[PDB]
Paper text:
Because SLRPs, and DCN in particular, have been described generally as dimeric proteins we first investigated the oligomeric state of [name] in solution by size-exclusion chromatography with multi-angle light scattering (SEC-MALS). Contrary to our expectations, the data indicated that the molecular weight of [name] was 54.7 kDa, a value consistent with a monomeric conformation in solution. To address this question, we determined the X-ray crystal structure of [name] at 2.17 Å resolution. The structure showed the typical curved solenoid fold characteristic of SLRPs displaying a large concave and convex surfaces. Despite the high concentration employed to crystalize the protein, [name] was found to be a monomer also in the crystalline state as demonstrated by the lack of stabilizing interactions and the small area of contact with neighboring protein chains in the crystal, as calculated with the PISA server. The structure of [name] was superimposed into the structure of DCN. The value of RMSD (calculated for the main chain alpha-carbons) was 1.3 Å, demonstrating that their overall fold was very similar. The difference in the dimerization propensity is explained by the lack of key intermolecular protein–protein interactions between neighboring units caused by variations in their amino acid sequence. [name] is an acidic (negatively charged) protein with a pI of 5.2, whereas collagen is a basic (positively charged) protein with a pI of 9. Considering that the main driving force of binding was electrostatic in nature (see above), we mapped the electrostatic surface of [name] in the crystal structure searching for negatively charged patches that could contribute to binding. We note that residues E284 and E303 located on the concave side near the C-terminal region of [name] are critical for binding, whereas the region near the N-terminal end do not seem to critically contribute to collagen binding as suggested from mutations L144W and Q145A.
SLRPs comprise an important family of proteins, divided into five subclasses, that influence collagen fibril formation. Recently, our group has demonstrated that [name] ([name]), a member of class II SLRPs, regulates the diameter and shape of collagen fibrils. In conclusion, we found that [name] binds to type-I collagen driven by weak electrostatic forces involving the residues Glu284 and Glu303 of a conspicuously, negatively charged patch of the protein. The weak nature of these interactions and the fast association and dissociation rates suggest that [name] shuttles on and off the growing collagen fibril in a fast-equilibrium.
Author numbering: 64 to 365
Write the structure that this text describes.
């Protein structure tokens, strides 16, 4: 009676936006369970005991605390693929979790603790969202993501990181580190991240980055706005979108951006954003000969 189970979508149960204080008893045939936007504090075993076929649980926008999640409640679900726990009051990374897990969303919590080996076995994880938490470098230093060899997307934005996370898996394609306090990137950091397509590092403290740190063969989006960069750098062939707003750039040195034109493979660059730098004039018109696909250069004010 508290939830709605449509007869035409019989494996789905909607318990969302109902001011629920507790998770109701879940029938055994339920595969998609929506409990978001409630006032739930605890996740107890008694609610899930027969619900062995759960593939997706949304518990986002609740008041769940780490200490009120019963041991094993998620881990005993052998087909759980997706777990949403964003917008809760979690202080630590939840464990144990089932190894079937593919997508785990933990954004907007208070995660400041991450137990040694908490990520082990999550070898099927493709998406991990930890944005808006309290992570700091010591939690990540032992290469904790390294065995997640299917991980495609890692969101670590709006945390308390001072360094680039070490030993990220080589599968990774999307890395967000926006709104941390990262100031350098170590020399060969990207050597074992050849699949990186999207790198978001806006709102950090980047300044004296290595020459050709961003010479990345599969990068498509590079977002380094609101940092302290003084110079342009070599644009890699694959890049399409470049976000450089709100840095300390006096001139975009076109020769550094493009030292040679190869007319058999033109660079893919399509979009540059450079507003709120210290540029006196537009970039040299010769940019269009190295980057023939440029459709927009946003200058705003400087
Ligand atoms: C779940 O089913 C078991 C039988 O495997 C039963 O003992 C238990 O009481 C049931 N739980 C419910 C209806 O919540
Ligand atoms: C991971 O995914 C594949 C199917 O894509 C499956 O065969 C394998 O059993 C899964 N591993 C775990 C530990 O759930
Ligand atoms: C940075 O993160 C803090 C919390 O860590 C948040 O309040 C702030 O808005 C964030 N800034 C941006 C630009 O996202
Ligand atoms: C471009 O960069 C090179 C090396 O940093 C330098 O020799 C040259 O003067 C620069 N050209 C400009 C700023 O127009």
């Amino acid at each position: 009676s508290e939830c709605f189970c449509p007869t035409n979508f019989p494996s789905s149960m909607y318990c969302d936006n109902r001011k629920l204080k507790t998770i109701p008893n879940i029938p055994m045939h339920i595969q998609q369970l929506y409990l978001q936007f409630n006032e739930i504090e605890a996740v107890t075993a008694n609610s899930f005991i027969n619900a062995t076929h759960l593939k997706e649980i949304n518990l986002s926008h609740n008041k769940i605390k780490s200490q009120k999640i019963d041991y094993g409640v998620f881990a005993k679900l052998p087909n759980l693929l997706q777990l949403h726990l964003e917008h809760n009051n979690l202080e630590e990374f939840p464990f144990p979790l089932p190894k079937s897990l593919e997508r785990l969303l933990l954004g907007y919590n208070e995660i400041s603790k991450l137990q040694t080996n908490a990520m082990d076995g999550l070898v099927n994880l493709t998406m991990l969202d930890l944005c808006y938490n309290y992570l700091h470098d010591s939690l990540l230093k032992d290469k904790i993501f390294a065995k997640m060899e299917k991980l495609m997307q890692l969101n670590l934005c709006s945390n308390r990181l001072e360094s680039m996370p070490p030993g990220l898996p080589s599968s990774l394609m999307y890395l967000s580190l926006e709104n941390n306090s990262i100031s350098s990137i170590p020399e060969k950091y990207f050597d074992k991240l050849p699949k990186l397509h999207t790198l978001r590092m806006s709102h950090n403290k980047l300044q004296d980055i290595p020459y050709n740190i961003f010479n990345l063969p599969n990068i498509v989006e590079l977002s380094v706005g609101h940092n302290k960069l003084k110079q342009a750098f070599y644009i890699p062939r694959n890049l399409e979108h470049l976000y450089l707003q709100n840095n300390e750039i006096e001139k975009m040195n076109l020769t550094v951006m493009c030292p040679s034109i190869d007319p058999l493979h033109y660079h893919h660059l399509t979009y540059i954003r450079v507003d709120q730098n210290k540029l006196k004039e537009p970039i040299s018109s010769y940019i269009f000969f190295c980057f023939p696909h440029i459709h927009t250069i946003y200058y705003g004010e400087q």
